Write a protein that binds this ligand. Structure first.
Ligand SMILES: CN1c2ccccc2[C@]23C[C@H]4[C@H]([C@@H]5C[C@H](O)N4[C@@H](C5)[C@H]12)[C@H]3O
Length: 121
Protein backbone atom coordinates (compact mmCIF):
# COMPACT_ATOMS: atom_id res chain seq x y z
CA UNK A 1 0.00 0.00 0.00
CA UNK A 2 0.92 3.68 -0.24
CA UNK A 3 2.05 3.47 3.38
CA UNK A 4 4.80 0.93 2.67
CA UNK A 5 5.71 2.54 -0.64
CA UNK A 6 6.08 6.01 0.90
CA UNK A 7 8.28 4.68 3.64
CA UNK A 8 10.42 2.67 1.22
CA UNK A 9 11.03 5.87 -0.81
CA UNK A 10 12.00 7.92 2.22
CA UNK A 11 14.45 5.28 3.40
CA UNK A 12 15.94 4.82 -0.05
CA UNK A 13 16.17 8.45 -1.27
CA UNK A 14 15.83 10.56 1.86
CA UNK A 15 12.98 12.36 0.05
CA UNK A 16 9.36 12.40 1.16
CA UNK A 17 7.37 10.78 -1.48
CA UNK A 18 4.93 13.62 -1.07
CA UNK A 19 5.59 15.95 -2.71
CA UNK A 20 8.81 14.89 -4.23
CA UNK A 21 7.40 11.95 -6.17
CA UNK A 22 3.62 12.53 -6.27
CA UNK A 23 3.48 15.37 -8.81
CA UNK A 24 6.69 14.96 -10.82
CA UNK A 25 6.84 14.93 -14.62
CA UNK A 26 4.19 13.03 -16.54
CA UNK A 27 3.90 9.78 -14.56
CA UNK A 28 4.96 10.37 -10.96
CA UNK A 29 1.61 10.76 -9.24
CA UNK A 30 -1.82 11.29 -10.76
CA UNK A 31 -1.50 10.59 -14.20
CA UNK A 32 -0.55 8.27 -17.16
CA UNK A 33 0.05 10.15 -20.41
CA UNK A 34 2.79 11.28 -22.76
CA UNK A 35 6.53 10.75 -22.94
CA UNK A 36 8.34 10.53 -19.59
CA UNK A 37 10.39 13.72 -19.06
CA UNK A 38 13.48 12.12 -17.49
CA UNK A 39 14.96 9.04 -15.78
CA UNK A 40 12.92 9.62 -12.60
CA UNK A 41 9.75 10.02 -14.64
CA UNK A 42 10.63 6.81 -16.46
CA UNK A 43 10.86 5.05 -13.08
CA UNK A 44 7.25 6.07 -12.44
CA UNK A 45 6.20 4.98 -15.93
CA UNK A 46 7.67 1.49 -15.37
CA UNK A 47 6.07 1.43 -11.92
CA UNK A 48 2.69 2.31 -13.44
CA UNK A 49 3.22 -0.53 -15.93
CA UNK A 50 4.20 -2.93 -13.15
CA UNK A 51 0.96 -2.23 -11.28
CA UNK A 52 -0.72 -2.66 -14.66
CA UNK A 53 0.36 -6.31 -14.67
CA UNK A 54 -1.84 -6.85 -11.58
CA UNK A 55 -5.46 -6.15 -12.67
CA UNK A 56 -7.07 -8.07 -9.77
CA UNK A 57 -4.77 -6.68 -7.04
CA UNK A 58 -5.21 -3.41 -5.14
CA UNK A 59 -1.70 -1.81 -4.86
CA UNK A 60 -2.77 1.43 -3.16
CA UNK A 61 -4.57 -0.26 -0.26
CA UNK A 62 -3.22 -3.80 0.11
CA UNK A 63 -0.52 -3.76 2.76
CA UNK A 64 2.64 -5.91 2.55
CA UNK A 65 5.62 -6.46 4.80
CA UNK A 66 9.25 -6.02 3.86
CA UNK A 67 12.49 -6.04 5.78
CA UNK A 68 15.95 -4.72 5.17
CA UNK A 69 18.86 -7.14 5.26
CA UNK A 70 21.56 -4.54 5.71
CA UNK A 71 20.69 -2.20 2.83
CA UNK A 72 18.75 -4.69 0.71
CA UNK A 73 14.95 -4.68 0.49
CA UNK A 74 13.46 -8.12 1.02
CA UNK A 75 9.73 -8.61 0.42
CA UNK A 76 8.22 -10.87 3.08
CA UNK A 77 5.86 -13.69 2.19
CA UNK A 78 2.18 -12.70 1.98
CA UNK A 79 -0.60 -13.23 -0.52
CA UNK A 80 0.33 -13.50 -4.18
CA UNK A 81 -0.87 -9.93 -4.75
CA UNK A 82 1.11 -8.54 -1.81
CA UNK A 83 4.33 -10.22 -2.99
CA UNK A 84 3.95 -8.89 -6.52
CA UNK A 85 3.01 -5.40 -5.36
CA UNK A 86 6.03 -5.26 -3.10
CA UNK A 87 8.34 -6.23 -5.97
CA UNK A 88 6.92 -3.38 -8.07
CA UNK A 89 7.52 -0.86 -5.28
CA UNK A 90 11.01 -2.16 -4.44
CA UNK A 91 12.03 -1.70 -8.08
CA UNK A 92 10.68 1.87 -8.16
CA UNK A 93 12.52 2.76 -4.92
CA UNK A 94 15.82 1.45 -6.35
CA UNK A 95 15.16 3.23 -9.64
CA UNK A 96 14.53 6.51 -7.80
CA UNK A 97 17.77 6.04 -5.84
CA UNK A 98 19.68 5.27 -9.02
CA UNK A 99 18.55 8.54 -10.64
CA UNK A 100 18.73 11.01 -7.73
CA UNK A 101 21.62 12.69 -9.55
CA UNK A 102 19.29 13.92 -12.32
CA UNK A 103 16.19 14.61 -10.21
CA UNK A 104 15.06 18.14 -11.24
CA UNK A 105 12.75 20.48 -9.28
CA UNK A 106 11.70 21.99 -12.59
CA UNK A 107 9.50 18.91 -13.12
CA UNK A 108 7.61 19.28 -9.86
CA UNK A 109 3.97 20.26 -10.40
CA UNK A 110 4.53 19.76 -14.12
CA UNK A 111 1.48 21.03 -16.13
CA UNK A 112 -0.70 18.46 -17.86
CA UNK A 113 -0.69 20.00 -21.43
CA UNK A 114 3.08 19.42 -21.68
CA UNK A 115 2.62 15.67 -21.35
CA UNK A 116 2.31 14.67 -25.01
CA UNK A 117 2.92 11.33 -26.70
CA UNK A 118 2.23 7.62 -26.70
CA UNK A 119 4.31 5.05 -24.85
CA UNK A 120 3.19 1.46 -24.44
CA UNK A 121 4.21 -0.71 -21.50
C1 LIG B 1 -4.08 -0.23 -17.88
N1 LIG B 1 -4.44 -0.11 -16.47
C2 LIG B 1 -5.25 -1.05 -15.90
C3 LIG B 1 -6.16 -1.93 -16.48
C4 LIG B 1 -6.78 -2.89 -15.65
C5 LIG B 1 -6.49 -2.99 -14.28
C6 LIG B 1 -5.56 -2.14 -13.67
C7 LIG B 1 -4.94 -1.19 -14.47
C8 LIG B 1 -3.94 -0.13 -14.18
C9 LIG B 1 -4.58 1.19 -13.90
C10 LIG B 1 -3.28 1.92 -13.93
C11 LIG B 1 -2.37 1.23 -13.31
C12 LIG B 1 -1.25 1.42 -13.90
C13 LIG B 1 -1.05 2.68 -14.00
C14 LIG B 1 -1.66 3.12 -15.06
O1 LIG B 1 -1.25 4.30 -15.56
N2 LIG B 1 -2.87 2.39 -15.19
C15 LIG B 1 -2.54 1.11 -15.68
C16 LIG B 1 -1.17 0.69 -15.19
C17 LIG B 1 -3.47 0.19 -15.58
C18 LIG B 1 -2.88 -0.15 -13.08
O2 LIG B 1 -3.05 -0.63 -11.73
Amino acid sequence: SLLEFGKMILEETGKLAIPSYSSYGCYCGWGGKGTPKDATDRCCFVHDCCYGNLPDCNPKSDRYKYKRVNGAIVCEKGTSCENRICECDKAAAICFRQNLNTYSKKYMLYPDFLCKGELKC
